[PDB]
Amino acid sequence: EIFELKAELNSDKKEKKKEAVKKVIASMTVGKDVSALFPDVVNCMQTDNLELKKLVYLYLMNYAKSQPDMAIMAVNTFVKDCEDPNPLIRALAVRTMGCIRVDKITEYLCEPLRKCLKDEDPYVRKTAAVCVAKLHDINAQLVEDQGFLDTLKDLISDSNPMVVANAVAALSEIAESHPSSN
Amino acid sequence: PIRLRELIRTIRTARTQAEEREMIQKECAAIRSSFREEDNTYRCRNVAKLLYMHMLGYPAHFGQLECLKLIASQKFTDKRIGYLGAMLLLDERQDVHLLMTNCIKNDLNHSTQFVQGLALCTLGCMGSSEMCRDLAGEVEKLLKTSNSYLRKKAALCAVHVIRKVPELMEMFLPATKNLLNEKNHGVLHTSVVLLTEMCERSPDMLAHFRKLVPQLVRILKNLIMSGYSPEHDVSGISDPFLQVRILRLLRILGRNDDDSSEAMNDILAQVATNTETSKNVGNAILYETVLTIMDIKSESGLRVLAINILGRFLLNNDKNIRYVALTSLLKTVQTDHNAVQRHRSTIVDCLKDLDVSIKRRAMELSFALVNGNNIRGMMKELLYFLDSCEPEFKADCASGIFLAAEKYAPSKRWHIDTIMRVLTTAGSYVRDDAVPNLIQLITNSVEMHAYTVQRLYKAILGDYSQQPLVQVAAWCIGEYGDLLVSGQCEEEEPIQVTEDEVLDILESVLISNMSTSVTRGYALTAIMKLSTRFTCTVNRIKKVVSIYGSSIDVELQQRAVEYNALFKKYDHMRSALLERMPVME
Amino acid sequence: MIHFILLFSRQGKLRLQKWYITLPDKERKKITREIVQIILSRGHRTSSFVDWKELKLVYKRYASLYFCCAIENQDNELLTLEIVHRYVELLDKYFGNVCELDIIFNFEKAYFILDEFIIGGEIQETSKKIAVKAIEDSDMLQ
Amino acid sequence: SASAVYVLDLKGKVLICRNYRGDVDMSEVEHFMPILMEKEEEGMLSPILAHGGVRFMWIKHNNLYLVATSKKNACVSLVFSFLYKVVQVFSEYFKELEEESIRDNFVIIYELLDELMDFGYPQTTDSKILQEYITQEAPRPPATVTNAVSWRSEGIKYRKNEVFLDVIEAVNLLVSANGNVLRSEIVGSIKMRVFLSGMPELRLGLNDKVLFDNTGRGKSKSVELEDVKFHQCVRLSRFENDRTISFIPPDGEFELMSYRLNTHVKPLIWIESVIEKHSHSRIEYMVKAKSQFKRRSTANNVEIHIPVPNDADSPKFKTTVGSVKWVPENSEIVWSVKSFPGGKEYLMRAHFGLPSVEAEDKEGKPPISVKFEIPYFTTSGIQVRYLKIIEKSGYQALPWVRYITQNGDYQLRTQ
Amino acid sequence: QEPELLISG
Amino acid sequence: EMRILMVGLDAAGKTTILYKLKLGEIVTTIPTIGFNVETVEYKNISFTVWDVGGLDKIRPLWRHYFQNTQGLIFVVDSNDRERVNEAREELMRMLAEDELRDAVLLVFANKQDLPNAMNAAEITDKLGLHSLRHRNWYIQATCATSGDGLYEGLDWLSNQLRNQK
Numbered sequence A: 001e002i003f004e005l006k007a008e009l010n011s012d013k014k015e016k017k018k019e020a021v022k023k024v025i026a027s028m029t030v031g032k033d034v035s036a037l038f039p040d041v042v043n044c045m046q047t048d049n050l051e052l053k054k055l056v057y058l059y060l061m062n063y064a065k066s067q068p069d070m071a072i073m074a075v076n077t078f079v080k081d082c083e084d085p086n087p088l089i090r091a092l093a094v095r096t097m098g099c100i101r102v103d104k105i106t107e108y109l110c111e112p113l114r115k116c117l118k119d120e121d122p123y124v125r126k127t128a129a130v131c132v133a134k135l136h137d138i139n140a141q142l143v144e145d146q147g148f149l150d151t152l153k154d155l156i157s158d159s160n161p162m163v164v165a166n167a168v169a170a171l172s173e174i175a176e177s178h179p180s181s182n
Numbered sequence B: 001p002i003r004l005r006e007l008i009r010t011i012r013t014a015r016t017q018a019e020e021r022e023m024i025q026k027e028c029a030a031i032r033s034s035f036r037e038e039d040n041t042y043r044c045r046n047v048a049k050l051l052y053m054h055m056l057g058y059p060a061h062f063g064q065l066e067c068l069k070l071i072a073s074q075k076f077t078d079k080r081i082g083y084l085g086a087m088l089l090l091d092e093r094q095d096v097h098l099l100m101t102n103c104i105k106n107d108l109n110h111s112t113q114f115v116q117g118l119a120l121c122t123l124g125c126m127g128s129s130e131m132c133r134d135l136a137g138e139v140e141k142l143l144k145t146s147n148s149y150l151r152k153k154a155a156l157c158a159v160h161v162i163r164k165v166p167e168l169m170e171m172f173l174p175a176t177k178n179l180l181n182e183k184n185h186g187v188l189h190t191s192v193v194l195l196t197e198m199c200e201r202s203p204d205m206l207a208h209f210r211k212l213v214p215q216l217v218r219i220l221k222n223l224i225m226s227g228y229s230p231e232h233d234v235s236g237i238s239d240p241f242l243q244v245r246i247l248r249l250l251r252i253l254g255r256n257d258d259d260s261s262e263a264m265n266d267i268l269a270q271v272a273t274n275t276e277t278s279k280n281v282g283n284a285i286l287y288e289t290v291l292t293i294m295d296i297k298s299e300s301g302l303r304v305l306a307i308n309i310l311g312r313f314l315l316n317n318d319k320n321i322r323y324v325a326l327t328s329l330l331k332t333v334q335t336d337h338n339a340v341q342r343h344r345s346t347i348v349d350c351l352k353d354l355d356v357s358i359k360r361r362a363m364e365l366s367f368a369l370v371n372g373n374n375i376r377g378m379m380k381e382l383l384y385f386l387d388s389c390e391p392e393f394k395a396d397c398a399s400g401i402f403l404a405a406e407k408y409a410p411s412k413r414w415h416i417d418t419i420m421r422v423l424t425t426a427g428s429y430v431r432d433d434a435v436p437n438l439i440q441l442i443t444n445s446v447e448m449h450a451y452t453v454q455r456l457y458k459a460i461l462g463d464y465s466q467q468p469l470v471q472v473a474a475w476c477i478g479e480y481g482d483l484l485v486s487g488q489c490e491e492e493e494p495i496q497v498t499e500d501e502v503l504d505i506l507e508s509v510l511i512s513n514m515s516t517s518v519t520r521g522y523a524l525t526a527i528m529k530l531s532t533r534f535t536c537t538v539n540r541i542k543k544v545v546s547i548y549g550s551s552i553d554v555e556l557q558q559r560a561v562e563y564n565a566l567f568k569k570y571d572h573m574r575s576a577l578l579e580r581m582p583v584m585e
Numbered sequence C: 001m002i003h004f005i006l007l008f009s010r011q012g013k014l015r016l017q018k019w020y021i022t023l024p025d026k027e028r029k030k031i032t033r034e035i036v037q038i039i040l041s042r043g044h045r046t047s048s049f050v051d052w053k054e055l056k057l058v059y060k061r062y063a064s065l066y067f068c069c070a071i072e073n074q075d076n077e078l079l080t081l082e083i084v085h086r087y088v089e090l091l092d093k094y095f096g097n098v099c100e101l102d103i104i105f106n107f108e109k110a111y112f113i114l115d116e117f118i119i120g121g122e123i124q125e126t127s128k129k130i131a132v133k134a135i136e137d138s139d140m141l142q
Numbered sequence D: 001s002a003s004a005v006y007v008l009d010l011k012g013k014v015l016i017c018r019n020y021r022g023d024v025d026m027s028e029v030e031h032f033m034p035i036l037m038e039k040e041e042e043g044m045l046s047p048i049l050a051h052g053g054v055r056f057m058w059i060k061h062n063n064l065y066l067v068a069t070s071k072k073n074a075c076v077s078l079v080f081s082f083l084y085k086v087v088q089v090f091s092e093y094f095k096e097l098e099e100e101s102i103r104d105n106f107v108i109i110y111e112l113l114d115e116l117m118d119f120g121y122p123q124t125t126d127s128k129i130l131q132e133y134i135t136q137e138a139p140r141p142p143a144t145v146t147n148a149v150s151w152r153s154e155g156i157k158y159r160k161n162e163v164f165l166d167v168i169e170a171v172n173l174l175v176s177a178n179g180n181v182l183r184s185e186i187v188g189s190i191k192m193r194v195f196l197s198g199m200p201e202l203r204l205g206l207n208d209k210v211l212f213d214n215t216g217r218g219k220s221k222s223v224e225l226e227d228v229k230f231h232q233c234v235r236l237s238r239f240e241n242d243r244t245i246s247f248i249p250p251d252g253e254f255e256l257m258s259y260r261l262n263t264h265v266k267p268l269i270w271i272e273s274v275i276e277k278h279s280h281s282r283i284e285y286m287v288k289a290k291s292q293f294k295r296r297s298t299a300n301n302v303e304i305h306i307p308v309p310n311d312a313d314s315p316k317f318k319t320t321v322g323s324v325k326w327v328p329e330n331s332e333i334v335w336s337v338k339s340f341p342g343g344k345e346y347l348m349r350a351h352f353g354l355p356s357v358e359a360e361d362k363e364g365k366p367p368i369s370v371k372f373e374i375p376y377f378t379t380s381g382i383q384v385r386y387l388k389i390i391e392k393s394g395y396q397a398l399p400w401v402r403y404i405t406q407n408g409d410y411q412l413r414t415q
Numbered sequence E: 001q002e003p004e005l006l007i008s009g
Numbered sequence F: 001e002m003r004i005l006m007v008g009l010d011a012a013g014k015t016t017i018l019y020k021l022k023l024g025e026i027v028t029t030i031p032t033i034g035f036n037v038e039t040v041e042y043k044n045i046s047f048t049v050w051d052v053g054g055l056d057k058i059r060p061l062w063r064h065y066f067q068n069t070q071g072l073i074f075v076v077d078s079n080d081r082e083r084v085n086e087a088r089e090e091l092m093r094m095l096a097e098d099e100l101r102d103a104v105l106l107v108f109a110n111k112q113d114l115p116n117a118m119n120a121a122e123i124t125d126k127l128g129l130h131s132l133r134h135r136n137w138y139i140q141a142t143c144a145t146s147g148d149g150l151y152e153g154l155d156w157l158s159n160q161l162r163n164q165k
Ligand SMILES: Nc1nc2c(ncn2[C@@H]2O[C@H](COP(=O)(O)OP(=O)(O)OP(=O)(O)O)[C@@H](O)[C@H]2O)c(=O)[nH]1
Pocket: F008, F009, F010, F011, F012, F013, F014, F015, F016, F017, F026, F029, F030, F031, F032, F033, F052, F053, F054, F055, F111, F143, F144, F145
């Protein structure tokens, strides 16, 4: 049940890899502890398939706070699909890497956030605006040191008003989360 | 009409409570329409489906007359479902149940013993006080029959008649003559239940029924040396319900009589030693044996055997047996008081047990085992148990602390300290009817009033969220402010009590919405009573009485209007009616 | 004296109720719901007796179906466990390897088994063969 | 800002689970159910339940519970609007949202729940453009996720360009037991079915009282709408400026308008029921229904739901027009006529039987509710004057309109 | 589950 | 259908020679925190390479990466004499388990273009690969900007992928 799924997930070929990830998502969805299967599904993360990437992203979203000291092995894959030419995978990576609520990897993902607050695609721009508030709720001191609040204030003034709406919601969240200085 | 199994299946195929209720009402409509057409064939299955409806929790008030019609019919299955429906639907307060006294009386003279036992079962289960008067002679004529099947049910009917109408108790006297000489154990069990019912109900026949104590001893004797039987036997021992009921009857007789206890003492020693303890059934027999031994006036040498059997019940690892040992040691506390006190370390060991019932009877056993020797020694553990508990236990713990410190106080200063400790720590879990007892013991503490008034003042000066604490404290401050303050008519050296912040915190519990509108009356009567005893501040008690004369609380408004009238017109009369009272007992 | 006997499942829904005391229907449903939540708010190691309004409630689990009895403060709790076990054995000897489904679909037969064993809150037939035999002759009596 | 959105069942176990902020502990969902029963026991049931610092904002569908959590002062109107919006999104993604449809569609429900909300904030909630890039059978994101026109996609074509308009009126009526009308309002709905190519600019023309008084033609027939609710596509600033309903419509079926007005005209179907209730014997119903609209109109499938006692039995029905059957599941009788012309008054008589033993608890009095529907008929008087369809390619599309008047909350109180 | 024997054997 | 593992240290040229095996040119690479999974079609055998980073907080995550691999690639930087000793400690701890016995071993000494570089024998008898048994080892002279060594490394993995011709 566990070792057989571990060996089937540690195999090579793609559709049974996708079915192993699909049944580990389904066994989380029926409500059992499956966090011991973490590196086998984390190892199949850079894939050309996007449904498989979404399910591995979902497992990483709800199973990285339970294993904080060992979920560090996804950051280079996160910054490597934060730079792909698909903006759906770029914004999905930004949205997922904002949701990894551990502290010692958030300094390693400030550079893809700085790259994705700047690019011409408004979908990944309005995702990076909310990811600024996610990283502020994680480490407000690291966000104030990196200077994301100044470029979130600059995202009020740009065009494409969903970017300015997400920047308004993020800056309002940061403003009530602030100690009312500056 | 659909069958009962199809209705049960249709109920089990429902998905939610609302859709279940719709199909309940859809079946009940067809059942009531079949009832309106007076159908004789399917009335049995309709009443049975309505009984399933009433078991699920739905109205079945329209089937009571059909239950009476099923009782009044001639078919046995109709009679069975009708008597079950009478038992399930009618009761004493239903008032349709009076209309089947004639039907039960007709079925008691039936030729069929199963119809007779059906009527006996329904009457003994749920017969009212009005049914038991005109059917008691019909019960008593079935108590003299040779049929054992009717005899045991007529005996339990006599139990129900005696329990319901206890002035029809003397008319079952000749029915119990040579009733213990029957051989079958169900009839013997119901006879023993009947004899202990009249012996518990009335004490005039205790010596009358004590002459069958050696007969009960001989029945228990051949019951114990009945080695193996394939009937009346569970887990290797024979007749446990009969043995426990016989030992309960032998507990009921002989508790104040000596010679029945000498006639019963040898078989009490024989049962208490020669029965097994490896099973729950033998543990039940030993628990009823030790209850019989410690309730009758038994021999003091085997009282030590009862101590040893309660000890090996106490260090049993089974939680049922530990509950049984705690309940038996709670059952005998007033007798052998020296012999309960050695188990106190084990009792406070199960006081910290995880089980709710174990720690509840351990708390009640520690409260019953509080005496005047090392009352401090149990008192630190009882306050530890109060301070470190899940908070359903705090009201009973604080109440038991109140009667323990009331009954066994060595000194008034320690009593004041422990009642302040339990008032500050328990707080809102203190029951509000104990506040007259607390005020009564404080007023009876005549030689010290200033220390307890200062401690109540310092406790409220921390917080006043605890309503019985502030209700004691406001009354004590208003009665004893004249020695709460001392020599403070003018400005003096800085002392921590300076006759203003006491009235400010009384003002605070008056203004705050976190008061229960009784402690506001306590604080207003305190502030009025402080007007006689304070000679420094003037025209402040008057205005705080005056602004409360238009309150939405009617008792507070009436009190403040009367006190404002006394202040405005009869200010010279307040010392005549606001003086201290002598104590009461 | 046994005051009432309750049978219920893990879902809290009632399977059988017999009452030897008289009290109204709203108080009946309230007492049954709070007693079911008291029993179902307890573990499997919790000593099988609860205290409830000077009545010790003797309960014992057998399957998903629970069995419960309420006695006064003079009876034996372990013999009430034996009374519950004797009622389960009478259900065994009538139905034959009884499950919850026989109780659900023959609640009136389980009621007849309780009436042949307990009337008035007290035991009438102590033995096992006599009560089942009386139900068998009343079943072929018709 | 919802911390986590859950889908549950009647037992309250988690069917599918989604975390957005993580400030609420994820295992607090098992505390939602006994808080719900203990608030239903005291009669203090609320849509917002609290467990210390965690607030449970929940809605209830036909089969499921949709619960949102928060640790802070959340915008609870935004949360409930989001919950009903993803109920609508799942209802267009699947046939019907039940307990079963979560389990086989869990991958696309996870993708949808990632797409719909980001960190407590709703992002993309249109199902028609949401189906363009996440499917159950993934490309680049479309421009219409982030464009100013967020409801309508570019590049869709139709061979026949048609707009279908459904001006649906819902008459809400509440009368007293004495027979006087205390509430009589019309809530309207313009449901539009758009099959158009390109980027059309649509201009809806109505007989608005404010528009007619501002123009100067306010002598003809017009409706005085008390409040107007518009879709996201409608230019609200220019509607306020010059009463102009200008919009680029979404593709397919959508509700453009929901207006509201109060009318002093007589109710369309009037019910007079006199109850001849006898204690422990019988209850008698004498119900007369008259249609007070015009004789050329005809109400179809009217159902006059009249409540009966729950312990009643053996119904005897006398009627002139229609059929009346007993529905004891709802503890009522409905009187179904198939065609109700205007100016006609019909009679119904119903007799039940009552038990001699009274019930333990009181019953309560639901009102009489009727369920009429009058097609080719409007009761307020609103007419669609035009629908100017302007496109840069240039075509002639055909706007089709129809007017349906149906019941809303059409209640009549009993004795 | 419901079709399971009541006695423990 | 076959799996290898490529591990090493910081600034070993590791992801750059992985992407040179992938496409052929060297791209700008950051220090790799997680992993890189790339496949390369070369002489009709699919070669899936599992590059894992080698930072100080990153090293004890390799215990899952030893599962289901029968080839090993070790990349050793040739300029940093003070961390050859912790490379020694890392190799002697990494080859001290009971799981990965059936895998071959490949040493990738790099940066043999600058005049501070050296040959490939003093590193070999300094590391002491003769003290460990049941393994195939030798070392060739590779470089970053020349691309040599990698193609004969794939030929090495080819002719002890199988036992036949
Ligand atoms: N272009 C080029 N760069 C080299 C060469 N040798 C070393 N580098 C340097 O090595 C770095 C890449 O090293 P990698 O093999 O990716 O190792 P790393 O940077 O520590 O990253 P990880 O080990 O995966 O954590 C580059 O940033 C270069 O600065 C070379 O021969 N050519």
